């Protein structure tokens, strides 16, 4: 009985900085380009230092009535002030927010998963309706 | 004499659908959140099918006067209509456009690299100035 799920946390993003917050329309037209914004640290900011940072956000789509989830994408945030001069002396920091664009032809659920280098995995989800 | 560079192409995105197009401000303030939008198929659309699609966009930052490039991030577009029902029968397509957010403290060059599953690697770049 060792499951990854035991170590995927969810919380109210109002209480917890680590929760990825999905911003996506509630209902869209079939095949139109939909913008999905996912942010970690939306209400409570999360640190972005060489030692402590959000590594990535991943988005999944679960089509209603489908048995599976589909990986929409993985969005890696890879600069956190590292330098040959020392940690946090670098020129560039990648913030844990991403806008991805999808085309859907069926209603389903958007699932966001994020990973902190020291605080593990965090998730949220939001239903999305598709129409002609 | 086998170099990856021999197989990284650049072109005018007006002529070539495969070129990643950077949209970023020309000049920013030190440590403010800067939005960088990168799109493949900005002017000429590129296919998004199970058989033929853009896999990812990667962003690099080259700080002026630094010897190195830094990987800002890798943004994977992972759904292209695959299904147990057959190719291109799936519910979701991830379009090759991404918005990433960075904080810079030095002027440099944004370098975009993209990868098509059948047409290889493509790049573009744009200078960015930082100020107090
Ligand atoms: Fe953390
Ligand atoms: Fe191609």
Curated annotation (Swiss-Prot), chains A, B:
Coiled coil: none annotated. Disulfide bonds: none annotated. Its cofactor is Fe cation. GO terms for molecular function: iron ion binding; superoxide reductase activity. It catalyses: reduced [rubredoxin] + superoxide + 2 H(+) = oxidized [rubredoxin] + H2O2. It is an enzyme of class 1 (oxidoreductase). It comes from the Bacteria. Its EC number is 1.15.1.2. Fe cation binds at residues 16, 18, 46, 52, 116, 119. Keywords: Electron transport, Iron, Metal-binding, Oxidoreductase, Transport. NCBIfam families: neela_ferrous. Uses electrons from reduced NADP, by way of rubredoxin and an oxidoreductase, to catalyze the reduction of superoxide to hydrogen peroxide. Belongs to the desulfoferrodoxin family. This is Putative superoxide reductase. It comes from Thermotoga maritima (strain ATCC 43589 / DSM 3109 / JCM 10099 / NBRC 100826 / MSB8). The lineage of its organism: Bacteria, Thermotogati, Thermotogota, Thermotogae, Thermotogales.
């Amino acid at each position: 009985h060792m499951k990854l799920s035991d170590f995927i946390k969810t919380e109210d993003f109002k209480k917890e900085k680590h929760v990825p917050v999905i911003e996506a329309p509630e209902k869209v037209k079939k095949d139109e380009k939909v913008q999905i914004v996912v942010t970690v640290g939306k209400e409570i900011p999360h640190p972005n230092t060489t030692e402590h940072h959000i590594r990535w956000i991943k988005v999944f789509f679960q089509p209603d009535g489908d048995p599976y989830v589909y990986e929409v994408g993985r969005y890696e945030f890879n600069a956190h002030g590292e330098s040959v001069q020392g940690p946090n002396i670098g020129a560039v920091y990648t913030e844990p927010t991403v806008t991805t664009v999808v085309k859907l032809n069926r209603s389903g659920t958007i699932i966001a998963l994020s990973y902190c280098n020291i605080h593990g995995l965090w998730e949220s989800s939001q239903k999305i309706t598709v129409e002609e």
